[PDB]
Ligand binder design. Structure first.
Ligand SMILES: *[C@@H]1O[C@H](CO)[C@@H](O)[C@H](O)[C@H]1NC(C)=O
Lengths: 89, 939, 49, 50, 49, 31
């Protein structure tokens, strides 16, 4: 391209960099902490979350008792991320 | 006939005894595997040097005649089964004789050397004989302990041979190496100038119905016009054409601001007079040219065109003039001249005369009296831009092939191609951002043509390893396969020597853009596999719980220190020279700052070492009887016979890893670094987390673990119930680490990298001493010897280059020390959160759930052995978030509900330990309706 | 010609030196993203902020 | 485009090699940087159809 | 040069006048009169603290 | 340089002609 200056291509393609993220994203949804410390072991996702509330000092009763509200607040929060980024700060 | 020279024709390059070194010399040598005529004695050429040889049994060949004669004499100077080989370079006569062209390596000792002082281009043998021709090449030569050149590599013969020379070794490890660069070379040369003729009106002066008479010699100014002087030259019948100012052929390319064409008709005898510094009647009174006059004078006969039978009386010349005329000056006056007194008026008389007497021209008159019309072009240069500038013929534009192109003054080399850009009418060239010409408009046809760079790139050689194979594959980075001269194309570039395979595997030599390479008997390329797919059985109600586990020892090597070096800048820059030292003092500040930066690096290396090892306060010791529940630390604890307290794994790690320039020793000896490690190990074994957090308290080792199990969510019962299985899994894991690090991978690659990087930097520093930097020579003594004031400037050049060499070294070491401070900072954090406590950070202290970790001292870093609990032997079950009993949700205090098809149980998360459901393990919080997934059971 | 080379060699050295300093800043961020992937994506962190 | 400049350049010698090795190390690290951030997965997991 | 001359165990080949180590520094010279290898080692230099 | 179209507008002037006069001019007049 230039006076001797070249840009060597990255070894991992954007599609390969995007299947790593997809596996990282499906081991987390299906199993949880498990896929990083041994064979990935399945648990239902509402259940993985009950353990993550138990691990910040709140208790399991809170997620099952507010599952729809936590799930909707979670869904609405994920929606604003794209809108804030698309609106652009 | 022709024969192949196999690694033959190598000679000792010089008289230096080099021992056990591989040295690269650029000299004239026989290209390896070249063509060798075979024989019979015809005279042969001596283009540069000749590897004459003569396989023989009866000594039939007795001399070489070169033109020098060798038969025993070497006159030009006189001096004192067979395979006599003789390299000759002009006249050194390196030679060797061996009893046996054979395939062998025999370097030629410089047995005979002569001061001939003559040039030789041809030769003959005075009487099998084979002749080869020496060519400039770069060769890496291997000397043995006795100083003999055992083997050599030519760096142009093959892609592998270039790689071996680049790494300066005869052995190459597997990988992709950037051996060199590839450049397409220009096919032809195109010169182009504007089509418009802009023809000067020489046509209306050189030929016209009538010409000017000599007294009123006419002058025509010619300018802003291209002219072809050679149109006058081609006929070549001119009586004169003498060009006083410059050569006739040379006229076309020159540029002059104005050309003054003065034309007159003069008789043949006086054509000679119109020359610079010539004196005669028509070159004095009328037109006269100065000594400095510059121009070409052209003349041709004209008896028919100008003369007439009646007598042409309409040219007239100036025969009496009172005062001589200055150069290029014309007087049209008819003022009666009259040398003498008696006032003659405007009416002529005894000494008064028309100063313009008449030429008489007739056809019968002999050559030399007949009219000879002449032109006196006078090309001239003025400070203003020249206009009269004749153009070159020009050459047809070549498109789509790399060519050397010159357009209207713009010189570049490139591939000309069609362009859709529309330049404004005034605009000519086009320039891209970065100020590079990227377009041009052809002067003759006024059309936009793009200029594109000729193909260039990097050549990288993929090698399976000299040990495995001599086959190689080449990647030309960023080149379409069409332009390189099986062949595959990737975004990385064109790959030759590797055939693409659809099946995918792990990466071996990364090629780029997602494609890797390997050695099968052949070299295959493919799309790398990120790994094997594994859909989990994701489901609303299904769980997997681990029923068994593994105890895994894993090893991480982190560098903690680098070599402390000190440089005497005066010894490096100057060195045993008094005059150089004085000039170095003139800058003054650089030497102290360089020394201060290097001292700061060295003091940090001690802090880096003592922030990792000096974490304990007192030197803890282990008990006389080493029974620790069956756990065997003999592999980690100190062994007294070994090179100190160095343990058996520490012993393996230790085995597995000038002039101005010193190395300062580490303050903490390897024995103390081993004693610090032994105390860190002794407290962890008989205390646990306690030594780091205060007084070192004591618990038995089976009881230190069972509290490292509790950290990872596993109940105490597991170690006490399964103690001996865990102790053997631990002992076997510790046993494999000795074997796995024993040679299976480049384990100690990170620590050996630090030793390699530092050594290469000091070697660059010593080699940079050899560089001249543009002065006469690198050696200070010679610069001082050859020159007197003159020498000081040349010494100053070396000091600047050598100071920049030292400044680059310190800057690079400051950047290297920052990485070692970061590694020492993590090594220090791993000591505290792993050896002195159990981390909950994920994958910080081992891959798995951390149980413990052990420090080992490697040469310039630490190796940590991380004991971790890996779950295994999974089984799948049914899970309900709460079990509803009496209309109350009953979530469990700690445990996951699970079912073996029919019965329901609470289980520890990471071990399958089923328990019946009762209120002690179950907490009731709510009503049955709100929970989704609740099941019906008794608690 | 030597004067042009000395300037051009210095300009390449300034670029290489600056890229080594910039590579170290990216190495630190790659190292934090590697820690964040392990302790946030692969486990729940108790570290604050 | 100048053979005359090239002949003079060889006198420095180590400058071109040191620059290429330094730039080559930056390049290999850029690849190691993306394999430590994203290759934390042994196998490529897939989400279920529903 | 300035240096210390000492007896040599190196066996120079018959035509080899000088010897050089890695870094191309003269390390040995075959003395002209007795044709025997005499090593060259630089005199003591070091830092003083 | 010249252009044919004082308005608040931007119009760059293309190079109409370059003359190789070679002489200094320090004064201007119009007819
Ligand atoms: C006049 O001179 C020009 C230039 O040499 C030549 O080409 C042309 O033929 C001549 N014409 C006549 C009428 O002599």
């Amino acid at each position: 391209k230039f006076n001797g200056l070249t840009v060597l291509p990255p070894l991992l393609t954007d599609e390969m960099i995007a299947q790593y993220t997809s596996a990282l994203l499906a081991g987390t949804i299906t199993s949880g902490w498990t896929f990083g410390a041994g064979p990935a072991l399945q648990i239902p996702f509402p259940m993985q979350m009950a353990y993550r509330f138990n691990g910040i000092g709140v208790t399991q009763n809170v997620l099952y008792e507010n599952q729809k509200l936590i799930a909707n607040q979670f869904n609405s929060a994920i929606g604003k991320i794209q809108d804030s980024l698309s609106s652009t700060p | 006939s022709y024969t192949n020279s196999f690694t033959r024709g190598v000679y000792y390059p010089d008289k230096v005894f080099r021992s056990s070194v591989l040295h690269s010399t650029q000299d004239l040598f026989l290209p390896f595997f070249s063509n060798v005529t075979w024989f019979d004695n015809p005279v042969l050429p001596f283009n540069d040097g000749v590897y004459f040889a003569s396989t023989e049994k009866s000594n039939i060949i007795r001399g070489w005649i070169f033109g020098l004669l060798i038969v025993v004499v070497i006159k030009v100077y006189v001096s004192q089964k067979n395979l006599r080989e003789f390299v000759f370079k002009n006249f050194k006569i390196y030679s060797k004789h061996t009893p046996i062209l054979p395939q062998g390596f025999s370097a030629l000792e410089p047995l005979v050397d002569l001061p001939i002082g003559i040039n030789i281009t041809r030769f003959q043998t005075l009487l099998a004989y084979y002749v080869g021709y020496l060519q400039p090449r770069t060769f890496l030569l291997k000397y043995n302990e006795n100083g003999t050149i055992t083997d050599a590599v030519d760096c142009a013969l093959d892609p592998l041979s270039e790689t071996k020379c680049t790494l300066k070794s005869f052995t190459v490890e597997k990988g992709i190496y950037q051996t060199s660069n590839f450049r397409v070379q220009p096919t032809e040369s195109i010169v182009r100038f504007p089509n418009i003729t802009n023809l000067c009106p020489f046509d209306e002066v050189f030929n016209a119905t009538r010409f000017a008479s000599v007294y009123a010699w006419n002058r025509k100014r010619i300018s802003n016009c291209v002219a072809d002087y050679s149109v006058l030259y081609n006929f070549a019948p001119f009586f004169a054409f003498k060009c006083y100012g410059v050569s006739p052929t040379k006229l076309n390319d020159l540029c002059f601001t104005n050309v003054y064409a003065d034309s007159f008709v003069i008789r043949g005898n006086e054509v000679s007079q119109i020359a610079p510094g010539q004196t005669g009647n028509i070159a004095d009174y009328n037109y006269k040219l100065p000594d400095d006059f510059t121009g070409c004078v052209i003349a041709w006969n004209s008896n028919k065109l100008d003369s007439k039978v009646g007598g042409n009386y309409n040219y007239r010349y100036r025969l009496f003039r009172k005062s001589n005329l200055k150069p290029f000056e014309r007087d049209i006056s008819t003022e009666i001249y009259q040398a003498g007194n008696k006032p003659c008026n405007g009416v002529a008389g005894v000494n008064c005369y028309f100063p313009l007497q008449s030429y008489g021209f007739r056809p019968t008159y002999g050559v030399g009296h007949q009219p000879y019309r002449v032109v006196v072009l006078s090309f001239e240069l003025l400070h203003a831009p020249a206009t009269v500038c004749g153009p070159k013929k020009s050459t047809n534009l070549v498109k789509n092939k790399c060519v050397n192109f010159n357009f209207n003054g713009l010189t570049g080399t490139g591939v000309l191609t069609e362009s859709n850009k529309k330049f404004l009418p005034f605009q000519q060239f086009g320039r891209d951002i970065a100020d590079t010409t990227d377009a041009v408009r052809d002067p003759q046809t006024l059309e936009i043509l793009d200029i594109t760079p000729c193909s260039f790139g990097g050549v990288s050689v993929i090698t399976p390893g000299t040990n495995t194979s001599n086959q190689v594959a080449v990647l030309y980075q960023g080149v379409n396969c069409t332009e390189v001269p099986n062949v595959f194309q990737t975004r990385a570039g064109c790959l030759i020597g590797a055939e693409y395979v659809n099946n995918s595997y792990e990466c071996d030599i990364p090629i780029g853009a997602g494609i890797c390479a390997s050695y099968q008997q052949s070299i295959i390329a493919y799309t790398m596999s990120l790994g094997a797919e594994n859909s989990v059985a994701y489901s609303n109600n299904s769980i997997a719980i681990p029923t068994n586990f593994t105890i895994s020892v894993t090893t991480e090597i982190l560098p903690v220190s680098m070599t402390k070096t000190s440089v005497d800048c005066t010894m490096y820059i100057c060195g045993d020279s008094t005059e150089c030292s004085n000039l170095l003092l003139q800058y003054g500040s650089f030497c102290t700052q360089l020394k201060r930066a290097l001292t700061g690096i060295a003091v940090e290396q001690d802090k880096n070492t003592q922030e990792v090892f000096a974490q304990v306060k007192q030197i803890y010791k282990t008990p006389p009887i080493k029974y620790f529940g069956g756990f065997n630390f003999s592999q980690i604890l100190p062994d007294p016979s070994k090179p100190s307290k160095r343990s058996p794994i520490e012993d393996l790690l230790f085995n597995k890893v000038f002039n101005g320039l010193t190395v300062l020793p580490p303050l903490l000896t390897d024995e103390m670094i081993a004693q610090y490690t032994s105390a860190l190990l002794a407290g962890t074994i008989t205390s646990g987390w306690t030594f780091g957090a205060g007084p070192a308290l004591q618990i038995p080792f089976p009881m230190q673990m069972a509290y490292r199990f509790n950290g990872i969510g596993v109940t105490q019962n597991v170690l006490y119930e399964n103690q001996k299985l865990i102790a053997n899994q631990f002992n076997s894991a510790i046993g494999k680490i000795q074997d796995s690090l024993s040679s299976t991978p480049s384990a100690l690659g990170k620590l050996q990298d630090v030793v390699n990087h530092n050594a290469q930097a000091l070697n660059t520093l010593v080699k940079q001493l050899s560089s001249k930097f543009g002065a006469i020579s690198s050696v200070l003594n010679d610069i001082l010897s050859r020159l007197d004031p003159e020498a000081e400037v040349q010494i100053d050049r070396l000091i600047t280059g050598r100071l920049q060499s030292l400044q680059t070294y310190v800057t690079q070491q400051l950047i290297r020390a920052a990485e070692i401070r970061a590694s020492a900072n993590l090594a220090a954090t791993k000591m505290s959160e792993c050896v002195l406590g159990q981390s909950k950070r994920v994958d910080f202290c081992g891959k798995g759930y951390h149980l413990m970790s052990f420090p080992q001292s490697a040469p310039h870093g630490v190796v940590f052995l991380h004991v971790t609990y890996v779950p295994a032997q999974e089984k799948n079950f049914t899970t309900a978030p709460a079990i509803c009993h009496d209309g109350k949700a009953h979530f469990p205090r700690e445990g996951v509900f699970v079912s073996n098809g029919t019965h329901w149980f609470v289980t520890q998360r990471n071990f399958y330990e089923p328990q019946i459901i009762t209120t002690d393990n179950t907490f009731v919080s709510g009503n049955c309706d709100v929970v989704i997934g609740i099941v019906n059971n008794t608690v």
